[PDB]
Amino acid sequence: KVFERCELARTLKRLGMDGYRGISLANWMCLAKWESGYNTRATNYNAGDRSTDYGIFQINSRYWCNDGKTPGAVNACHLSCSALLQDNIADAVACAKRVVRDPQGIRAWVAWRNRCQNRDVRQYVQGCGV
Ligand SMILES: [Cl-]
Ligand SMILES: [Cl-]
Ligand SMILES: [Cl-]
Protein backbone atom coordinates (compact mmCIF):
# COMPACT_ATOMS: atom_id res chain seq x y z
CA LYS A 1 0.00 0.00 0.00
CA VAL A 2 0.97 3.64 -0.50
CA PHE A 3 0.19 5.55 2.72
CA GLU A 4 -1.08 9.08 2.70
CA ARG A 5 1.24 11.38 4.66
CA CYS A 6 -0.87 12.07 7.74
CA GLU A 7 -2.24 8.50 7.92
CA LEU A 8 1.32 7.24 8.07
CA ALA A 9 2.30 9.77 10.72
CA ARG A 10 -0.48 8.61 13.01
CA THR A 11 0.28 4.95 12.23
CA LEU A 12 3.93 5.38 13.24
CA LYS A 13 2.96 7.31 16.34
CA ARG A 14 0.71 4.44 17.49
CA LEU A 15 3.63 2.06 16.94
CA GLY A 16 5.86 4.05 19.29
CA MET A 17 8.18 5.71 16.78
CA ASP A 18 7.92 9.25 18.13
CA GLY A 19 11.20 9.89 19.84
CA TYR A 20 12.40 6.33 19.64
CA ARG A 21 16.12 6.52 20.50
CA GLY A 22 15.97 10.24 20.10
CA ILE A 23 14.37 10.24 16.62
CA SER A 24 11.37 12.52 16.07
CA LEU A 25 8.34 11.38 14.07
CA ALA A 26 9.14 13.95 11.40
CA ASN A 27 12.53 12.31 10.89
CA TRP A 28 10.89 8.91 10.41
CA MET A 29 8.44 10.51 8.01
CA CYS A 30 11.22 12.15 6.00
CA LEU A 31 12.98 8.80 5.84
CA ALA A 32 9.92 6.90 4.55
CA LYS A 33 9.16 9.69 2.09
CA TRP A 34 12.56 9.61 0.41
CA GLU A 35 13.18 5.89 0.72
CA SER A 36 9.90 4.71 -0.78
CA GLY A 37 7.33 7.42 -1.26
CA TYR A 38 5.46 5.83 1.63
CA ASN A 39 5.12 2.56 -0.30
CA THR A 40 5.24 -0.75 1.60
CA ARG A 41 5.54 -3.01 -1.45
CA ALA A 42 8.70 -1.45 -2.99
CA THR A 43 11.83 -3.55 -3.59
CA ASN A 44 15.13 -2.27 -5.05
CA TYR A 45 17.88 -4.61 -6.17
CA ASN A 46 21.44 -3.45 -5.65
CA ALA A 47 23.33 -5.06 -8.48
CA GLY A 48 26.56 -3.80 -6.98
CA ASP A 49 26.52 -6.05 -3.90
CA ARG A 50 23.63 -8.43 -4.64
CA SER A 51 21.48 -7.18 -1.76
CA THR A 52 17.94 -5.84 -2.00
CA ASP A 53 16.15 -3.08 -0.14
CA TYR A 54 12.59 -3.85 1.07
CA GLY A 55 9.47 -1.91 1.89
CA ILE A 56 8.58 1.49 3.25
CA PHE A 57 11.99 2.13 4.87
CA GLN A 58 13.95 0.23 2.22
CA ILE A 59 15.62 -2.03 4.74
CA ASN A 60 18.59 -3.92 3.34
CA SER A 61 18.96 -7.69 3.14
CA ARG A 62 22.69 -7.78 3.87
CA TYR A 63 22.29 -6.88 7.55
CA TRP A 64 18.65 -6.78 8.53
CA CYS A 65 16.31 -9.40 7.04
CA ASN A 66 16.73 -12.78 5.32
CA ASP A 67 15.94 -13.25 1.64
CA GLY A 68 18.07 -16.31 1.14
CA LYS A 69 19.79 -14.85 -1.90
CA THR A 70 22.19 -12.26 -0.45
CA PRO A 71 25.71 -13.63 -0.08
CA GLY A 72 27.22 -13.47 3.36
CA ALA A 73 24.16 -11.82 4.80
CA VAL A 74 22.81 -11.79 8.27
CA ASN A 75 19.32 -11.11 9.65
CA ALA A 76 19.47 -8.91 12.71
CA CYS A 77 15.74 -8.22 12.65
CA HIS A 78 15.17 -11.98 12.58
CA LEU A 79 12.50 -11.68 9.87
CA SER A 80 11.97 -12.86 6.34
CA CYS A 81 12.37 -9.84 4.05
CA SER A 82 8.79 -10.77 2.98
CA ALA A 83 7.67 -9.37 6.35
CA LEU A 84 8.85 -5.95 5.17
CA LEU A 85 6.46 -5.98 2.19
CA GLN A 86 3.23 -6.16 4.20
CA ASP A 87 0.57 -3.43 4.20
CA ASN A 88 0.73 -3.63 7.97
CA ILE A 89 3.99 -2.01 8.98
CA ALA A 90 4.36 -3.38 12.49
CA ASP A 91 7.21 -5.70 11.54
CA ALA A 92 8.90 -2.99 9.47
CA VAL A 93 8.73 -0.61 12.43
CA ALA A 94 10.19 -3.24 14.76
CA CYS A 95 13.02 -3.74 12.32
CA ALA A 96 13.59 0.00 11.92
CA LYS A 97 13.80 0.19 15.72
CA ARG A 98 16.44 -2.57 15.61
CA VAL A 99 18.48 -0.67 12.98
CA VAL A 100 18.61 2.45 15.14
CA ARG A 101 19.71 0.50 18.23
CA ASP A 102 23.05 0.31 16.51
CA PRO A 103 25.62 3.13 16.89
CA GLN A 104 24.77 5.12 13.71
CA GLY A 105 21.09 5.37 14.57
CA ILE A 106 19.13 6.94 11.78
CA ARG A 107 22.33 7.74 9.89
CA ALA A 108 22.23 4.13 8.80
CA TRP A 109 20.15 5.24 5.82
CA VAL A 110 22.13 7.42 3.39
CA ALA A 111 18.91 8.98 2.08
CA TRP A 112 18.29 10.36 5.52
CA ARG A 113 21.72 12.05 5.51
CA ASN A 114 21.05 13.42 2.00
CA ARG A 115 17.40 14.51 2.36
CA CYS A 116 16.62 14.95 6.06
CA GLN A 117 19.71 15.57 8.18
CA ASN A 118 20.25 19.20 9.17
CA ARG A 119 17.01 20.23 7.44
CA ASP A 120 13.69 21.67 8.55
CA VAL A 121 11.50 18.56 8.47
CA ARG A 122 8.48 20.01 10.22
CA GLN A 123 6.40 19.90 7.03
CA TYR A 124 6.20 16.10 7.10
CA VAL A 125 3.92 16.11 10.19
CA GLN A 126 2.11 19.42 9.67
CA GLY A 127 -1.62 19.12 10.27
CA CYS A 128 -1.53 15.36 11.08
CA GLY A 129 -2.58 15.46 14.71
CA VAL A 130 0.69 13.93 15.98
CL1 LIG B 1 15.64 16.65 14.73
CL1 LIG C 1 8.86 -13.39 8.83
CL1 LIG D 1 -0.63 -6.96 5.20
The secondary structure of residue 52, as a DSSP letter, is E
The enclosing domain of 127 has a CATH number of 1.10.530.10
Residue 30 contacts residue 116 (beta carbons within 8 Å):
yes
Task: Find the 93 Cα to ligand 3 centroid distance in Å.
Answer: 13
Q: Are 92 and 59 in contact (CB under 8 A)?
A: yes
Residue range(s) defining the domain that contains residue 87 = 1-130
Work out how many domains the chain is built from and give that number: 1
83-87 CB contacts, 8 Å cutoff, 24+ apart: 84/54, 84/55, 84/56, 84/57, 84/59, 85/40, 85/41, 85/43, 85/54, 85/55, 86/40, 86/55, 87/1, 87/40
Residues 6+ apart with CB under 8 A from 47: none
Axis crossing angle, helix 25-36 with helix 5-14, rounded to the nearest 10: 130
Q: How was this structure determined?
A: X-ray
From ligand 1's centre to the CA of 80, what distance in Å? 31
- The rounded Å distance from CA 120 to ligand 3 centre is 32
Where in the sequence numbering do the catalytic residues fall? 35, 53
